[PDB]
Amino acid sequence: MFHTRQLLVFAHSYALVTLIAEHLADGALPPQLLFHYRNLVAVLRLVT
Amino acid sequence: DYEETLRLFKTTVTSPNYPELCYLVDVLVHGNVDAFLLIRTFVARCIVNMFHTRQLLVFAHSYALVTLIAEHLADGALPPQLLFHYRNLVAVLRLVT
Numbered sequence: 001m002f003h004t005r006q007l008l009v010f011a012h013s014y015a016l017v018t019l020i021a022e023h024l025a026d027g028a029l030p031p032q033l034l035f036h037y038r039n040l041v042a043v044l045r046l047v048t
Numbered sequence: 049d050y051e052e053t054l055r056l057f058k059t060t061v062t063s064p065n066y067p068e069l070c071y072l073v074d075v076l077v078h079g080n081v082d083a084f085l086l087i088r089t090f091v092a093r094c095i096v097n098m099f100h101t102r103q104l105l106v107f108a109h110s111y112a113l114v115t116l117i118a119e120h121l122a123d124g125a126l127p128p129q130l131l132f133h134y135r136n137l138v139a140v141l142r143l144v145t
Contacts, residue, residue: 022064025064025065025102026065027101031101031102031103032103034102035103038063
């Protein structure tokens with residue numbers, strides 16, 4: 001989806017974003033795609 | 049100017065996906081020079097793979113490993129940019145002292 005439509009998906013839900021940031025970091029995704037979700041979690045931490 | 053290296057360092061140490069065996073190698077070497085020298089190729093492959101697949105440089109959590117990488121792993125055997133990041137860590141240490 002990122003390659004084709006230039007948008008990251010599963011961003012509509014907290015649970016999927018957190019799970020992707022945690023469990024999908026060992027590889028799989030290119031590092032930038034992971035870093036976007038990681039930055040979203042970081043934004044939540046900053047607001048906290 | 050060392051801001052780039054410090055930003056990479058902060059990214060690494062804050063990252064929750066820091067690989068575990070970095071702790072294992074660190075606790076196994078004790079910072080013993082001969083022990084590290086035995087495991088050169090392993091740690092070099094680790095740092096290169098972890099940098100390419102993840103935006104972080106490993107073994108940054110340990111002073112002994114950082115200094116050993118900066119000193120011994122400089123004679124080729126590693127892409128220059130990562131070696132310079134470790135050099136900049138050591139140079140920051142010298143500047144603050």
